[PDB]
Symmetry: C2
């Protein structure tokens, strides 16, 4: 019983975090085998960030311009290259703590755990979602750049996010581990801003199923809806359209609870039109959209990771 925002255990990632310094900038890097991955903006001065040419800036660097520190041990940089917006520093030592891992580019609406780090040292772990507008609502202070997001599948760490910057509204932008930004953002000082966001409908529905599993049904009703009629309401409330693929994904939760997907859609429609009337669901007075269907099944069924 119970339902909490739950992160993956972070130990496999903690053993990969290092500090990278270039000039006056220190940030975090990810050490896997004999390569350290970090944001390429580590090579920039503040003046560079107005309109940097990274190819031109990087060709001017030498290996000894990069200081990599793993705990109390300096790693010697022996090569470097740039892949999109990620810098890859080849070091003379393979990380003995490298876990099984893969790099994965996620879709909006997916969740992941973040290990927030400063000066190469982990500070905390929390759970996030990739918003529809390709930002994350993280918790990051100065020096957090290079911190990573991940999921774990059995024993395999799937890295999906590296933190690059904070946008004017206080939300965060970053890349996959191959250096491609999520969203339209660039690693340059411009007027770029988060676009209008929407609520992740399939996730709200998953969380309503979690609430039923945990023994609360107050928000259910006797109605159903068509997919098309539900999406008319969703659009009105700035919710993402619900697709047939989303309905299919919710199949297992529907089967476990005995509540047809479109019947749960009718309950969400009534919640959107009438509000929660001072009631709560799973300890929240608003509709929560940062649990995926997979997250609900994992927490309500008890999957582990060795």
């Amino acid at each position: 019983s119970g339902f909490r925002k739950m992160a993956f255990p972070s130990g496999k990632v903690e053993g990969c975090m290092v500090q990278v310094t270039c000039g006056t900038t220190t940030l975090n890097g990810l050490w896997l085998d004999d390569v350290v991955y970090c944001p390429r903006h580590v090579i920039c001065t503040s003046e560079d960030m107005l309109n940097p040419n990274y190819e031109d800036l990087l060709i001017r660097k030498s290996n000894h311009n990069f200081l990599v520190q793993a705990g109390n041990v300096q790693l010697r940089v022996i090569g470097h290259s740039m892949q999109n917006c990620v810098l890859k520093l080849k070091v003379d030592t393979a990380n003995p703590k490298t876990p099984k891992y893969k790099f994965v580019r996620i879709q909006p609406g997916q969740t992941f755990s973040v290990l927030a780090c400063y000066n190469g040292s982990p500070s905390g772990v929390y759970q996030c979602a990739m918003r529809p507008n390709f930002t994350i609502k993280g918790s990051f202070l100065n020096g957090s750049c290079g911190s990573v997001g991940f999921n774990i599948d059995y024993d395999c760490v799937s890295f999906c996010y590296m933190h690059h910057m904070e946008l004017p509204t206080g939300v965060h932008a970053g890349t996959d581990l191959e250096g491609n930004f999520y969203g339209p953002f660039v690693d340059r000082q411009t007027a770029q801003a988060a676009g209008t966001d929407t609520t992740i409908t399939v996730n709200v529905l998953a969380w309503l199923y979690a609430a039923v599993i945990n023994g609360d049904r107050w928000f259910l009703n006797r109605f159903t809806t068509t997919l098309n009629d539900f999406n008319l309401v969703a659009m009105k409330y700035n919710y993402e359209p619900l697709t047939q693929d989303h309905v299919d994904i919710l199949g297992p939760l529907s089967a476990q609870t005995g509540i047809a997907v479109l019947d749960m859609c009718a309950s969400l429609k009534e919640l959107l039109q009438n509000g929660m009337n001072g009631r709560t669901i799973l300890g929240s007075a608003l509709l929560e959209d940062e649990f995926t269907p997979f997250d609900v099944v994992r927490q309500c069924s008890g999957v582990t990771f060795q």
Copy 2:
């Protein structure tokens, strides 16, 4: 920027989790040096739990009745003893991954991270508080018993909770790592239930300071209050009394924001009397009480742990 429920990095604890089996019961244990700690109810059958005499049950056990598995490796039990409600199994191997650690009994209102585990394998990490009624609102399924709660201070893991059971309302009860229950609970099947709970006032105030730090002031007002007058309202809303020691603890957040503690109390009083009027604070439509003053300072200032 940002503010999330943030757990401590769990790697130091992951390396301590093992599986303990006695008869038909399997649960989790904590392996530190050459001792495994677990709930003593592992020795009970379901019939035993109605009215167990643990001294009488344990004297009948042999070392070979306890199966301890660390990953794929069996640890041989070479002795056992009971301390309050915790069983201590001496094993023939010291855990090479034992971190620096201490055992600490916490006060109600304090927070800690939980590493939820099943069959000795970590599943997830989340942040909890010890409620005033000495329960926790965890997320635990069958097999989670023996999972632990902890805080980290520099490099030292302070263990403060071991999970023992779920109460009828779905909340959770357990012990310190020396086997003493929090609250009046016992490791026997009885009619025991959670008492009435209250809201942790000093934590709500800390979270309002976090909101101001992150740039939101909508709920502030021009009023102040006396400590005594505030506590009259707190009692009416089922909030814990605010003590002078709590005011002192909030000193640093007050100094950083320029908002006197009793002025923040006047804002909380107005929030209790008028509600939030459809507004949110730090993404919540209710007043959050599971962040301590220390938690706020850590997340808004950026402390790490090596």
